[PDB]
Amino acid sequence: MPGTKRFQHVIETPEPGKWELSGYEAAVPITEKSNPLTQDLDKADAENIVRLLGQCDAEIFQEEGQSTYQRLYSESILTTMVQVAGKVQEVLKEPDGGLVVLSGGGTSGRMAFLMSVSFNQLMKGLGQKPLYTYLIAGGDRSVVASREGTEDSALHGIEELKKVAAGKKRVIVIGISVGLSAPFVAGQMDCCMNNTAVFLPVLVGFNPVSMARNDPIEDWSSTFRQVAERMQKMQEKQKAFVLNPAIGPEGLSGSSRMKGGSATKILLETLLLAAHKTVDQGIAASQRCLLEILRTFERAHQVTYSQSPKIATLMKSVSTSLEKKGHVYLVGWQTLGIIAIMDGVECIHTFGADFRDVRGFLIFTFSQEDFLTSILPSLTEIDTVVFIFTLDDNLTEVQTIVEQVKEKTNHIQALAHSTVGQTLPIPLKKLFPSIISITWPLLFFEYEGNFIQKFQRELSTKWVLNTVSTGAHVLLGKILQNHMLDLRISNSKLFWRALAMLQRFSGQSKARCIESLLRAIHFPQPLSDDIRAAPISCHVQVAHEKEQVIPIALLSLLFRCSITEAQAHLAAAPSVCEAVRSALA
Numbered sequence: 001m002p003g004t005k006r007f008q009h010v011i012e013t014p015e016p017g018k019w020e021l022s023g024y025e026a027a028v029p030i031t032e033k034s035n036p037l038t039q040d041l042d043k044a045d046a047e048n049i050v051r052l053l054g055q056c057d058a059e060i061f062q063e064e065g066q067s068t069y070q071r072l073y074s075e076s077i078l079t080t081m082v083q084v085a086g087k088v089q090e091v092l093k094e095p096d097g098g099l100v101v102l103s104g105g106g107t108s109g110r111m112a113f114l115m116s117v118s119f120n121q122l123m124k125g126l127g128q129k130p131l132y133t134y135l136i137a138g139g140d141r142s143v144v145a146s147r148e149g150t151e152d153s154a155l156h157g158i159e160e161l162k163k164v165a166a167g168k169k170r171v172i173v174i175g176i177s178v179g180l181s182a183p184f185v186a187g188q189m190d191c192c193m194n195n196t197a198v199f200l201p202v203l204v205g206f207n208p209v210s211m212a213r214n215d216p217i218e219d220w221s222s223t224f225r226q227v228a229e230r231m232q233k234m235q236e237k238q239k240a241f242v243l244n245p246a247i248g249p250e251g252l253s254g255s256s257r258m259k260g261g262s263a264t265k266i267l268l269e270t271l272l273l274a275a276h277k278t279v280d281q282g283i284a285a286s287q288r289c290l291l292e293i294l295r296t297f298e299r300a301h302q303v304t305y306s307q308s309p310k311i312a313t314l315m316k317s318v319s320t321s322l323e324k325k326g327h328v329y330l331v332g333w334q335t336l337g338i339i340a341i342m343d344g345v346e347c348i349h350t351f352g353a354d355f356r357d358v359r360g361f362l363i364f365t366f367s368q369e370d371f372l373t374s375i376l377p378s379l380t381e382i383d384t385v386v387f388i389f390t391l392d393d394n395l396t397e398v399q400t401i402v403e404q405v406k407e408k409t410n411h412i413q414a415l416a417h418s419t420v421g422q423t424l425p426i427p428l429k430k431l432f433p434s435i436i437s438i439t440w441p442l443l444f445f446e447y448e449g450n451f452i453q454k455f456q457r458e459l460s461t462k463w464v465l466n467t468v469s470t471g472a473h474v475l476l477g478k479i480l481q482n483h484m485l486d487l488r489i490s491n492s493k494l495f496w497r498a499l500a501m502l503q504r505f506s507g508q509s510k511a512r513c514i515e516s517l518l519r520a521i522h523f524p525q526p527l528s529d530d531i532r533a534a535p536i537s538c539h540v541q542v543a544h545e546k547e548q549v550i551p552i553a554l555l556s557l558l559f560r561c562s563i564t565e566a567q568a569h570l571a572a573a574p575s576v577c578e579a580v581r582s583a584l585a
């Protein structure tokens with residue numbers, strides 16, 4: 001029938017009580033799963049939220065139990081990390097005609113950017129030509145923009161790869177897709193297997209290959225799963241690699257910007273840094289060198305979340321500023337500035353928030369005075385302003401801007417990284433009464449710009465900002481249990497996540513859920529056979545432009561009513577959340 005092909009991969013909705021027994025839950029990719037720890041995230045208070053998300057983040061370092069999926073510390077994974085460092089080494093010995101690409105969509109693309117900068121610095125600091133570069137779905141401007149739609153083309157990913165692999169003789173392509181999902185990466189990886197003489201594909205994500213994405217890609221013949229299954233066979237001959245530990249579900253279901261983006265840096269910084277740090281020693285990469293670095297990243301989480309109460313407080317101030325109708329400014333220096341901007345942008349698609357709601361700033365890339373003349377005047381009693389810096393930064397540029405921001409605002413908490421024994425100038429820096437001081441041990445670093453210190457600090461800032469941006473929105477009641485129900489469908493994965501949320505919350509059949517979603521997307525047009533049979537990209541392109549698609553679809557189903565009736569009910573209610581929750585009662 002019309003649509004049977006498009007929706008063939010959709011598993012039927014199970015009867016109540018058989019969600020486990022039907023085999024449905026076992027087929028939900030780890031990355032999309034409901035994290036049991038956060039079943040009541042929507043009820044947790046600020047302090048609980050910090051705790052629940054700290055716990056979730058800790059899962060990245062949890063070891064493999066006794067049958068079960070491999071994890072970061074499992075020997076299969078560390079062995080693979082070693083073999084990849086090794087391949088990275090061959091290139092590093094032979095920089096002429098060598099390149100190393102880090103590629104991903106969305107937050108994977110953002111992580112790829114940071115890491116390619118860092119390792120480019122490191123080879124500069126040694127006076128070697130930079131061998132690294134990034135590739136992000138939608139070109140360079142996707143780094144600091146919400147552009148969720150650009151990950152859905154495999155030809156675009158291959159094109160970008162073609163641009164950059166120029167007339168190189170030896171290219172390593174690290175395809176990063178947390179969900180082993182993005183069509184952007186799948187075609188990069190497949191292209192690589194078709195020219196092994198030059199390309200070496202390495203795929204990074206956090207699903208087992210048997211849960212890799214398997215619905216058709218509109219511009220490509222193979223699925224991500226097939227691609228990944230074939231790379232896995234190539235790994236026996238060391239011609240492709242898959243690096244895919246389970247780190248457990250996200251605390252907000254499917255929000256791979258969080259653990260996924262964290263585990264991406266942890267995993268790839270660890271392995272790249274081992275590789276460099278051991279080439280110049282005339283030693284192979286070994287599990288032992290990786291381990292040192294992993295354990296440092298694991299200390300970094302303990303260090304970070306020991307500041308929990310102050311993280312919770314900052315969340316309560318971010319949440320208030322937004323509950324009223326203020327704005328939140330995230331102001332930071334060098335790469336923490338960027339991480340800040342990345343965080344604020346992700347809030348647009350993640351929570352349906354305006355670009356002003358949580359915005360990042362680097363010293364998007366504004367000057368001391370420029371920020372002072374331009375942005376400073378727009379501030380107000382109710383806003384929250386966050387400063388994010390090292391004691392190594394230029395604290396005279398820092399102290400100025402806080403001086404000036406104190407005038408027009410008082411909610412100004414801050415996030416300061418220091419190596420132990422450094423002191424915070426102005427002991428009357430009770431400009432910041434209750435700072436977030438993260439103090440780091442002394443570690444032995446033989447490289448120039450202390451990269452392990454950079455990586456620690458970036459990760460810890462990432463975690464604080466992610467937990468804050470995310471907690472602030474849950475407190476406002478925008479999250480339903482641990483699901484973001486009212487997302488904007490802006491790519492095929494989101495379209496599938498929407499369909500899944502409909503099955504999970506209504507309990508009704510696949511055909512009904514699908515019908516209600518398409519009716520909601522295409523209203524006021526009725527369901528035709530063309531619409532039913534359309535590529536998912538047509539549904540996406542229409543939904544992207546609307547509001548409350550998913551909640552309307554769900555109300556239609558719960559009330560067993562039309563779209564006209566569900567839209568009128570939604571308008572009768574005080575809020576979307578209240579409409580939905582009271583309909584769920």
Ligand SMILES: C[C@H]1COCCN1C[C@H]1CN(S(=O)(=O)c2cccs2)CCN1c1ccc([C@@](C)(O)C(F)(F)F)cc1
Binds near residue numbers: 212
């Ligand atoms: C639509 C459902 C059921 O049929 C198979 C597809 N399922 C959706 C899964 C996976 N999709 S995906 O195909 O884009 C993908 C595969 C691999 C990486 S992405 C994404 C969303 N999925 C999903 C999401 C949420 C659920 C929930 C909502 O049931 C819960 F979060 F609770 F698990 C279930 C499945």
Ligand SMILES: O=P(O)(O)OC[C@@H](O)[C@@H](O)[C@H](O)[C@@H](O)CO
Binds near residue numbers: 177255256257
């Ligand atoms: O790395 P993946 O699974 O290919 O996901 C790629 C992107 O969709 C993802 O990073 C998304 O932009 C974030 O908003 C998820 O919280």
